[PDB]
Design a protein around this ligand. Structure first.
Ligand code: HEM
Ligand SMILES: Nc1ncnc2ccccc12
Length: 289
């Protein structure tokens, strides 16, 4: 099962920068969503959930086919709340109907990270929409009520190693949990990409509490929370070393996140040798827009 990247006909960097800009301008303008957090975090989660269905064993799932647009995947309980991200992107897709669904969903994630003052994420085009029968079954996305061994084993299916996992999890500095979506509540209202997830893990006094959905979570008196899978990163000696590394080196974290996030968004895709190089998009700020 091979998925070969195919560039949208006649399109080049400038076309994709236009799409980036449209997403970035809407992120700035539609700023009241989720108590003024904005749509950045939910776009990051959407890009991860469309990618995180991949299975390295048979090359099913992943970002290539844009299958989140079909009912089976859209309605996966694990995807509850992402409809908000889809609705955000819908007018963009109407304005740029030539872009594939996988390209749009993945570019939304890249745009969000960069516009939230995160690292540059190189991005490649050429995902191609595939038919409804290629949609993966529900149940490929991870549970939150588990431990370090579960997280490690889960991420092996996505060909991620312990450094890649710890780096990717740093996205949990962003946004929050919502009881009605996932049965976890809280996290505050951060929409700036930093290494604070690692600093919070190490520095806060965490208490194991039960929330209103009868699930356990780790809460601090400062008002922060960690999922059981978040907290597992300081329970496992290998993960803990890496958490300490990122808490102490913002730049290293940015660089490792950039690589892991690009890999996540590209898993399963074969790029021909004559495909364009990855694009690095300018932010609105870099453009003076
Ligand atoms: C073991 C792996 C993971 C688990 C169990 C997990 C679980 C969750 C849960 C339960 C939520 C709350 C959803 C809601 O209530 O609205 C969430 C939110 C989020 N996750 Fe993850 N996640 C994992 C990995 C990741 C990865 C790898 C990324 C990105 C690189 C990511 C990015 C996000 C973001 C940005 C949000 C916030 C969404 C919002 O504010 O609407 N997560 N995650
Ligand atoms: N803001 C968050 N802090 C800790 N863990 C999380 C897990 C999921 C989403 C947001 C957070």
């Amino acid at each position: 099962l091979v998925h070969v990247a195919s560039v949208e006909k006649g399109r080049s960097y400038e076309d994709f920068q236009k799409v980036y800009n449209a997403i970035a301008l809407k992120l700035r303008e539609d700023d009241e969503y989720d108590n003024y957090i904005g749509y950045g975090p939910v776009l990051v989660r959407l890009a991860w959930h469309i990618s995180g269905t991949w299975d390295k064993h048979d090359n099913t799932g992943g970002s290539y086919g844009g299958t989140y647009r079909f009912k089976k995947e859209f309605n996966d309980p694990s995807n509850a709340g992402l409809q908000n991200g889809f609705k955000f992107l819908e007018p963009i897709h109407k304005e740029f109907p030539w872009i594939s669904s996988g390209d749009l969903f993945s570019l939304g994630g890249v745009t969000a990270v960069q516009e939230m003052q995160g690292p540059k994420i190189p991005w490649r085009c050429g995902r191609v929409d595939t038919p409804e029968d290629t949609t993966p079954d529900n149940g490929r996305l991870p549970d939150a009520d588990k431990d370090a061994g579960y997280v490690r084993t889960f991420f092996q299916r996505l060909n991620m190693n312990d450094r890649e996992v710890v780096a990717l999890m740093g996205a949990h500095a962003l946004g929050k949990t919502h009881l009605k979506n996932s049965g976890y509540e809280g996290g505050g209202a951060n929409n700036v990409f930093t290494n604070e997830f690692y600093l919070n893990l190490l520095n806060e006094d965490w208490k194991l509490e039960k929330n209103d959905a009868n699930n356990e979570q780790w809460d601090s008196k400062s008002g922060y929370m960690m999922l059981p899978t978040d907290y597992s990163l300081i329970q496992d000696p290998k993960y803990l070393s890496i958490v300490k590394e990122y808490a102490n080196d913002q730049d290293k974290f940015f660089k490792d996140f950039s690589k892991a996030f690009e890999k996540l968004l590209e898993n399963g895709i074969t790029f021909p040798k004559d495909a364009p190089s990855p694009f690095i998009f300018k932010t609105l700020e870099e453009q003076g827009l």
